[PDB]
């Protein structure tokens, strides 16, 4: 965790919120309590990440500036969270869930397939700087275990082949039907809806007295 100034990643890379971005910046502040802006560093740091994935040392200094906080304060927030990237991020940035639930349901299986398809090691960007693969931890959505979040797409319940299909979709064209590519809606017993197969009771159903 040390930023050794590099021509690419260093403040020479000027950063400033787009007129549109700055707008976004302010409203957030009001979301938080008055007299409190520091609390918005994360949400803001996130929009710097939205602006640019790299988020260089220059970008964090601006965040601290806009949020008038000790610069270190922003540096500490960026380092602690994995969501922020302090290094350039691939356009697609796929992340594969490899906690025990997904592994038990084959998460590892998927990995090998994706490494070959991207033809690259796990943890770095493709030469085409097209995709970046990382072994991220539990991303939620375990019921659907095989899983690979791509810029929030959160594809789910994927069999090795499915991803290759998805990756191709990403490689040529866009928006490859993000979501569980399975036949189960959101999370649903693959068998059906044992929980509630009847119609839902309407408003004020059996509302207790009092």
């Amino acid at each position: 965790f040390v930023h050794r100034d590099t021509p690419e990643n260093n403040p020479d890379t000027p950063f400033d919120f787009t007129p549109e971005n700055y707008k976004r910046i302010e409203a957030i502040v009001k979301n938080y309590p008055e007299g409190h802006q520091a609390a918005a560093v994360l949400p803001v740091l996130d929009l710097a990440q939205r602006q640019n994935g790299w988020l260089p040392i220059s970008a964090m200094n601006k965040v601290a500036e806009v949020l008038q906080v000790p610069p270190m304060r922003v540096y500490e927030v960026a380092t602690f969270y994995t969501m922020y990237n302090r290094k350039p991020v691939g356009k697609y940035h796929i992340q594969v869930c490899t906690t025990t639930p997904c592994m038990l349901r084959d998460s590892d299986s998927i990995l090998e397939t994706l490494q070959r398809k991207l033809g690259i090691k796990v943890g770095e960007t493709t030469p085409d700087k097209l995709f970046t693969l990382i072994e991220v931890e539990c991303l939620g959505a375990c019921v659907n275990a095989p899983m690979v979040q791509i810029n929030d797409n959160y594809y789910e319940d994927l069999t090795p082949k499915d991803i290759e299909e998805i990756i191709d979709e990403l490689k040529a064209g866009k928006v490859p039907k993000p979501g569980p590519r399975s036949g189960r809606f959101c999370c649903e017993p693959a068998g059906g809806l044992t929980s509630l197969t009847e119609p839902p009771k309407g408003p004020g159903f059996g509302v207790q007295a009092g």
Binding site: T100, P101, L104, R105, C142, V143, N144, A145, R184, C187, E188, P189, A190, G191
Partner: peptide
């Protein structure tokens, strides 16, 4: 989740 025929919530 894991090693069950129809994993679901």
């Amino acid at each position: 989740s894991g090693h069950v025929n129809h994993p679901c919530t």
